[PDB]
Design a binder for these strands. Sequence first.
RNA 1: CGACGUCGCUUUUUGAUCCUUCGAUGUCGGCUCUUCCUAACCUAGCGCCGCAGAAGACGCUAAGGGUUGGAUUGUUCACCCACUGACAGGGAACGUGAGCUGGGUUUAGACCGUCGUGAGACAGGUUGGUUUUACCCUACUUAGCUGGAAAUUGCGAGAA
RNA 2: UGCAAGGCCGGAAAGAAAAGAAUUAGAGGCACCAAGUGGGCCUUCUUCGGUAAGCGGAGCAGGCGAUGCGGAAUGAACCGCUUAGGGAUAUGUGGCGUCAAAACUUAUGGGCUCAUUCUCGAUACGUGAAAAGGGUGUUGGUGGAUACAGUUGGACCCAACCGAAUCCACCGGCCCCGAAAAUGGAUGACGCUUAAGCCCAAUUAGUGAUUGCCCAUUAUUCCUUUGGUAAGGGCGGAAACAAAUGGAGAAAGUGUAGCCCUUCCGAUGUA
RNA 3: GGCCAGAACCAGCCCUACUGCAUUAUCCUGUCGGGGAUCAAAAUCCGGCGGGCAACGAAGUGCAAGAAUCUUGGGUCUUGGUGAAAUGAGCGGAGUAUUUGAGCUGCGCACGGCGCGCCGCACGCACUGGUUUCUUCUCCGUGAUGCUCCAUGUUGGCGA
Lengths: 186, 158, 178
Amino acid sequence: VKVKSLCTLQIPEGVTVDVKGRKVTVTGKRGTLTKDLTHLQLDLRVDKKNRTFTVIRWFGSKIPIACLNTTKAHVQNMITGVTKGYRFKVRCAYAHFPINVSVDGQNIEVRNFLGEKRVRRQLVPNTVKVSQTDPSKVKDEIVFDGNDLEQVSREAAVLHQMCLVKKKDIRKFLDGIYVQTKTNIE
Amino acid sequence: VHSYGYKSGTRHLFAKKFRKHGVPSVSTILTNIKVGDYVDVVADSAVREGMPHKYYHGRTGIVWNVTPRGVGVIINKPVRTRTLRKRICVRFEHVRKSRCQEAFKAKEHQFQAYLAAKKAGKALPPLQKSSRLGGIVRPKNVEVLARRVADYEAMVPY
Amino acid sequence: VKPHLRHYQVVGRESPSEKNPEPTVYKFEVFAPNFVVAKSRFWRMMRVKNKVKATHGDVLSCKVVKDAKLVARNYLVDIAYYSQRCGYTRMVKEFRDVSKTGAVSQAYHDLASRHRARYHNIEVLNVKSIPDHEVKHLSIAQYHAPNLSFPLLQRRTKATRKDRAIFVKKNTKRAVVA
RNA sequence: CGACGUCGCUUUUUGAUCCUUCGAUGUCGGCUCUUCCUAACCUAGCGCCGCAGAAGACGCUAAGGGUUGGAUUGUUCACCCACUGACAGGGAACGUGAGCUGGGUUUAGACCGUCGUGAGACAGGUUGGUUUUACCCUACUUAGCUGGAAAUUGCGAGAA
RNA sequence: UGCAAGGCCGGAAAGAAAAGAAUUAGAGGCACCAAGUGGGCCUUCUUCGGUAAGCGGAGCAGGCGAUGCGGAAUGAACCGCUUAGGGAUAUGUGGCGUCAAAACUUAUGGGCUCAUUCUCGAUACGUGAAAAGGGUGUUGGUGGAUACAGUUGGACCCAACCGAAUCCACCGGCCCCGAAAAUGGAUGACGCUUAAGCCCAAUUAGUGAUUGCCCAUUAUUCCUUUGGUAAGGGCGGAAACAAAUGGAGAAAGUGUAGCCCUUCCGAUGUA
RNA sequence: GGCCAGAACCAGCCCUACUGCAUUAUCCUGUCGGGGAUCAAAAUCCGGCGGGCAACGAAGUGCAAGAAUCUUGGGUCUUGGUGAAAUGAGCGGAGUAUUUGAGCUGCGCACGGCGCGCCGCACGCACUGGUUUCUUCUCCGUGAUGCUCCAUGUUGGCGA
Ligand SMILES: CC(=O)O[C@@H]1[C@@H](O)CN[C@@H]1Cc1ccc(OCC(=O)N[C@@H](CCCCN)C(=O)O)cc1
Ligand SMILES: [K+]
Ligand SMILES: [K+]
Ligand SMILES: [K+]
Ligand SMILES: [K+]
Ligand SMILES: [K+]
Ligand SMILES: [K+]
Ligand SMILES: [K+]
Ligand SMILES: [K+]
Ligand SMILES: [K+]
Ligand SMILES: [K+]
Ligand SMILES: [K+]
Ligand SMILES: [K+]
Ligand SMILES: [K+]
Ligand SMILES: [Mg+2]
Ligand SMILES: [Mg+2]
Ligand SMILES: [Mg+2]
Ligand SMILES: [Mg+2]
Ligand SMILES: [Mg+2]
Ligand SMILES: [Mg+2]
Ligand SMILES: [Mg+2]
Ligand SMILES: [Mg+2]
Ligand SMILES: [Mg+2]
Ligand SMILES: [Mg+2]
Ligand SMILES: [Mg+2]
Ligand SMILES: [Mg+2]
Ligand SMILES: [Mg+2]
Ligand SMILES: [Mg+2]
Ligand SMILES: [Mg+2]
Ligand SMILES: [Mg+2]
Ligand SMILES: [Mg+2]
Ligand SMILES: [Mg+2]
Ligand SMILES: [Mg+2]
Ligand SMILES: [Mg+2]
Ligand SMILES: [Mg+2]
Ligand SMILES: [Mg+2]
Ligand SMILES: [Mg+2]
Ligand SMILES: [Mg+2]
Ligand SMILES: [Mg+2]
Ligand SMILES: [Mg+2]
Ligand SMILES: [Mg+2]
Ligand code: NA
Ligand code: NA
Ligand code: NA
Ligand code: NA
Ligand code: NA
Ligand code: NA
Ligand code: NA
Ligand code: NA
Ligand code: NA
Ligand code: NA
């Protein structure tokens, strides 16, 4: 076993990171994020003066050591969530039948996917903001905005997974609602 | 299948040794067998007359009867709960004088020789001492006994 | 806990005879639970190496070799074991211990757990204390740090056998059944 | 999908054995009825294709539900006609005869062919040939009476 | 006067030395007269026929039959131990989380393992459940190669930024896939994963020495019975002694309430 | 009282406490040289040299014979007793010593370097040697004129 293994992360100027019993809170502008990591069993420390977040695994084999670079990536993702945000641009692709997507307040309805009369409905949580772009600017685009990367995705994924072609060749019949760009809000 | 004749299962038993074939020699003819002598009964495969049964090959007993061309031997024979004293009739070519009492006869003659020397003022041989006693060992050559990597490489063929 | 193997130096030879009036004296190094196993391992090496049987030889000494003072050290153990599938497998392993016997006892427990090897299928070739700069394994070299420290975490601290209890009040130390 | 090789699983086939049963465990099939297995025929989901569509091949999780009507045959099988989403494969003493039936097997009558001098014999054909008993104990199905927390007692004291 | 044989007369005899130089719960031999048996079966090793079989057939030896007892949950044969009827103390095989005695879940021992519907594993015998083949699950070996390296990024099948250790082949350990059957079900059940699983190792733990604990029809010892191929003592009443107020017995003996006392050994069993 | 129970002691058994002899050297030290890693060291490590006891609660190393009397261990509801022959280092009489180990030593012989007699001798064997510095107790004694079995305490409770 390895006596001490650690990962180090740098905290920017406008964001504060707090740890208390494996529970991480990241507060920057544009919001605050929380992660419950009590399943991980690591030694997380924050140095406020030096603005650095450290996670240590004491006396670990390969399996527990893999969890400290996962933790560093998660805390990093909350830093760039409450500083820049997350914006996923998702486009509807079709060959013959237009995919009519109607975005109400936190509600998505998809019609005419491959000519089907069934309406696919998805309710987006209040922590993710969904909008439809102007068709003049770009045709058939839906944008998901939020602070949580794990929440902005899993709305683009749920939209993708519901417009899946069934009982047909998938190499042909490429219709669907695919995510094109994964960018930041600011 | 297997049959039970006089010479059944004697293929390797009644066979001459490699490059040791031939009828018995002159020293066998000139050997004197007397009544009361211990003899080994070992069948000569080249004679095939007066031959003993396969059981008595390798057995030794005392001579009880001497005959112009034959010798009578008493041999023990464990039969069920007791051993029988069997008198077999063989030719002289199938018996050898037995050295089974040679070490005992040599011990008896040593005692009489020792007695004679002791009674009449003679020097007896010094007594042998046990090799199992202790002592101080001064080693000329001392080596280290250990397993080496070369030992494992050697035992791998090809 | 103190090691279960002891450092033995068995000295012996073949019994002098007419063919060998002055036989060679052999010094053997073995780690064994007792001197009866030590003599058994000595005569196993004599038979399979020098073609000398225990019944045709004698033992000059079977004393225990004194341990050095207890110091945290790195020990290089050259060891081999036999399995039917692979034959003889010789490995060199590094251990952190305070004594030669402790390192070899550790190597026997190591070969048992990791390779299912028993004592009589194992042959120790060499054990020695090496400097920090000759250590190849990172798992051993991590204890050479001049300032090495770590917290004691996830520790199950059992009570003194006299003071152990069955039922204890939830947030106090008072024993209900003891 | 898979030659030449090679490694297995199953006990729904036959063989091998001869352990139990010869003061007897009723011996085929069908009908009836329930249940279990999964090596999945249909039905629910899903991968992959030499996957355009339609139809389909291969595979995975899954035995909850379903899996027919008939001509010939005692037949299990077999074969054909027809419907269907489909008409999967098996076990339960080759499930099930004090549940039935008795077509077959399986006595005594009789005919045939072959065999035998003969009486007679034929996993050769043919026709006719008694299917007994529950009121006991359990198990199931309903139907009643009735004590009991120290599961009859202690007075032995615990309230969701 | 030599050889062979039957004797006779003498001699010598560590009564068998020393060199590792035997040991014995070693009374040898000899009769007589009888019974049940004369279906066997199972094992470690050797072994023949058969694809094999809880199959048929042998060798040496143990065992069951004929025999319980303590253990492997259960089992004629495995393991321990073999048996007069009772106690105490120790064990053996097997155990010490509960059932269930013992670590009230021992240590101030070391490693490995995560196993989603026959639900990982903890089956000696017992195959009384498993193979070939495979795994970028984890953690150990062996032999090589590279190292301002390997991987990103920019430039164009190739070197420069980058700043550290990387990756190639092959062997193990545990785990996983291979791995499908019919009533509901079986490490014995629960449950166990800082194991209560697997390998190794201890005995209150680097402290100061070399027996942790629990269970037998076993071992040791004590009491009693019974029988000996039983071993011995005593048995010629020593002397004295009334009740009212020390006693009784003492048989020359197979077997009795045994003539009495001491001692040693055995004690199961179908026909 | 032939009943119940508690303590005393006896004898025998069964458990524990209390330990000496040998051993160590691949060891313990100090110092030089190297080597190592540091901010600089030190240490781990390898060599030469000088001393040596890691020191008796040193070592988990070989064997242990230590009178549970001194110096009131424990148990016997696992034995039998209350002195109806108490064989005692334990009961009773004497005496203040002898002896047996450890120290230290004499001669000779064994034993060990080196060689055909010098040195050593851990202290073996004979004089059951010498000294007594410390460590121990030692010396006497009861036949059966008992052939055998039974019969002799204390304190309560219960029983008038
Ligand atoms: C109650 C009882 O006895 O059951 C015993 C138990 O051991 C168990 N089975 C035995 C009875 C049995 C049942 C079926 C059998 O199969 C049929 C067969 O092969 N032959 C028939 C034909 C006889 C007439 C020919 N002339 C037959 O023998 O009955 C055989 C034997
Ligand atoms: K019948
Ligand atoms: K029918
Ligand atoms: K389907
Ligand atoms: K049947
Ligand atoms: K029927
Ligand atoms: K007929
Ligand atoms: K057999
Ligand atoms: K006991
Ligand atoms: K452990
Ligand atoms: K394998
Ligand atoms: K592996
Ligand atoms: K008696
Ligand atoms: K009284
Ligand atoms: Mg299609
Ligand atoms: Mg032969
Ligand atoms: Mg021959
Ligand atoms: Mg093929
Ligand atoms: Mg048979
Ligand atoms: Mg009947
Ligand atoms: Mg019957
Ligand atoms: Mg019946
Ligand atoms: Mg399936
Ligand atoms: Mg189904
Ligand atoms: Mg069903
Ligand atoms: Mg019909
Ligand atoms: Mg069947
Ligand atoms: Mg019936
Ligand atoms: Mg009927
Ligand atoms: Mg009929
Ligand atoms: Mg007829
Ligand atoms: Mg009619
Ligand atoms: Mg018979
Ligand atoms: Mg049992
Ligand atoms: Mg218990
Ligand atoms: Mg079992
Ligand atoms: Mg289970
Ligand atoms: Mg069990
Ligand atoms: Mg008897
Ligand atoms: Mg000390
Ligand atoms: Mg006295
Ligand atoms: Na830890
Ligand atoms: Na069969
Ligand atoms: Na049968
Ligand atoms: Na008929
Ligand atoms: Na008929
Ligand atoms: Na009825
Ligand atoms: Na069986
Ligand atoms: Na037995
Ligand atoms: Na009498
Ligand atoms: Na007796």
